[PDB]
Amino acid sequence: AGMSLTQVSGPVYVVEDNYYVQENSMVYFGAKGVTVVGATWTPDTARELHKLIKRVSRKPVLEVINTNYHTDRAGGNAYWKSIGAKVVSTRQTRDLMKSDWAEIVAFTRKGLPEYPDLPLVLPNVVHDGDFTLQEGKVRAFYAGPAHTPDGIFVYFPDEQVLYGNCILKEKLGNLSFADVKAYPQTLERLKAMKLPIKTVIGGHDSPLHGPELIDHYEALIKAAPQ
Ligand SMILES: [Cl-]
Ligand SMILES: [Cl-]
Ligand SMILES: [Cl-]
Ligand SMILES: [Cl-]
Ligand SMILES: [Cl-]
Ligand SMILES: [Cl-]
Ligand SMILES: [Zn+2]
Ligand SMILES: [Zn+2]
Ligand SMILES: [Zn+2]
């Protein structure tokens, strides 16, 4: 299908968004409602995700996290705002989005001319640092720069699932905006946290991996050109 929504563990679901270049996002079905992690590529892809969500739960979409300022994590924002869902990010992500959205949209349209010329839609819930949602069961944190300067990890402690964002994935991928030397230092900062991890969800390629995805990408980025 164009998009799928699939249970990984308990209330934790993976979204495979096969629009444009495949990106994987997540959904958490909570007591009061639904948290989306990654806004998806466009307002259209966001509507498609919302349609899948409504087939699983009647509860409201409470909030959507922009895990970085890029089009694949924030492109859906217009749609999420339109249904009254909070759009959530760190201050850094919001500031970079304000300054650099036009440029990341232009860069996206270079490789994907079919991609829409989306206007800026900023987060309206902006956090000073690390933060949690869903009674502490969804935990967003910064461990340094990697694919972008601002990209955060999202950890689900009950299910021991780590969302890898654009930071962790199977293929080395486009290193254009990447801090290549800092990248492994961020992954080692993550390792030093010693989070219990059974599952890592890569933000591109095939989503479902074990904790080895971290080591897999670390080895790839340490061999990169640059
Ligand atoms: Cl399922
Ligand atoms: Cl353009
Ligand atoms: Cl990222
Ligand atoms: Cl593998
Ligand atoms: Cl694996
Ligand atoms: Cl792996
Ligand atoms: Zn990106
Ligand atoms: Zn990405
Ligand atoms: Zn793997």
Side-chain angles (χ1 to χ4, degrees), residues 1-176 178-225:
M3 181 176 288
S4 70
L5 177 63
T6 305
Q7 187 183 45
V8 179
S9 185
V12 178
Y13 281 64
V14 61
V15 178
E16 296 178 11
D17 168 13
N18 304 305
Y19 287 72
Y20 308 109
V21 174
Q22 178 187 334
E23 65 84 7
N24 311 309
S25 294
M26 295 182 71
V27 173
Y28 184 94
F29 290 95
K32 304 178 181 185
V34 183
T35 302
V36 179
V37 189
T40 80
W41 278 115
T42 67
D44 193 56
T45 63
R47 197 175 273 261
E48 288 300 311
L49 173 54
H50 192 200
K51 285 192 298 186
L52 295 175
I53 290 172
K54 286 189 212 147
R55 287 183 184 272
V56 172
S57 175
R58 89 166 182 289
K59 294 179 175 176
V61 179
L62 298 166
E63 65 232 333
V64 62
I65 302 173
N66 296 329
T67 50
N68 63 41
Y69 77 94
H70 282 191
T71 39
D72 62 354
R73 301 308 165 209
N77 284 358
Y79 180 80
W80 302 117
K81 302 281 267 290
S82 78
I83 70 161
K86 297 161 178 166
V87 174
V88 181
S89 76
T90 62
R91 171 73 53 194
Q92 178 185 16
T93 291
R94 188 228 74 107
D95 290 344
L96 283 172
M97 197 187 291
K98 186 164 99 169
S99 67
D100 287 40
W101 180 251
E103 288 176 15
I104 192 64
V105 170
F107 178 87
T108 306
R109 288 158 52 88
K110 218 170 95 67
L112 302 156
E114 62 273 11
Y115 187 86
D117 191 14
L118 299 178
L120 178 61
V121 180
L122 289 169
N124 58 358
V125 175
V126 183
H127 292 283
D128 294 341
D130 297 349
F131 62 94
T132 68
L133 317 84
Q134 297 287 350
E135 315 171 51
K137 303 311 190 55
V138 179
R139 302 184 46 95
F141 68 85
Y142 167 86
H147 166 68
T148 59
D150 61 313
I152 54 160
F153 289 102
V154 175
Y155 179 61
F156 306 85
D158 293 344
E159 299 81 14
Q160 301 189 29
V161 175
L162 179 77
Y163 182 54
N165 198 359
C166 305
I167 301 173
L168 302 171
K169 54 208 167 191
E170 298 183 316
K171 295 184 193 166
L172 190 59
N174 198 305
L175 301 177
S176 283
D179 187 328
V180 173
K181 286 190 185 306
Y183 215 121
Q185 296 160 350
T186 295
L187 299 185
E188 291 286 339
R189 272 184 293 261
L190 169 71
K191 287 169 162 186
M193 296 167 177
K194 298 169 178 158
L195 301 173
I197 296 173
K198 288 171 178 176
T199 295
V200 179
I201 298 306
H204 295 284
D205 313 301
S206 189
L208 296 167
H209 297 269
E212 302 86 356
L213 195 59
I214 296 160
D215 304 280
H216 179 265
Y217 198 88
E218 187 180 0
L220 290 177
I221 199 68
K222 282 182 86 165

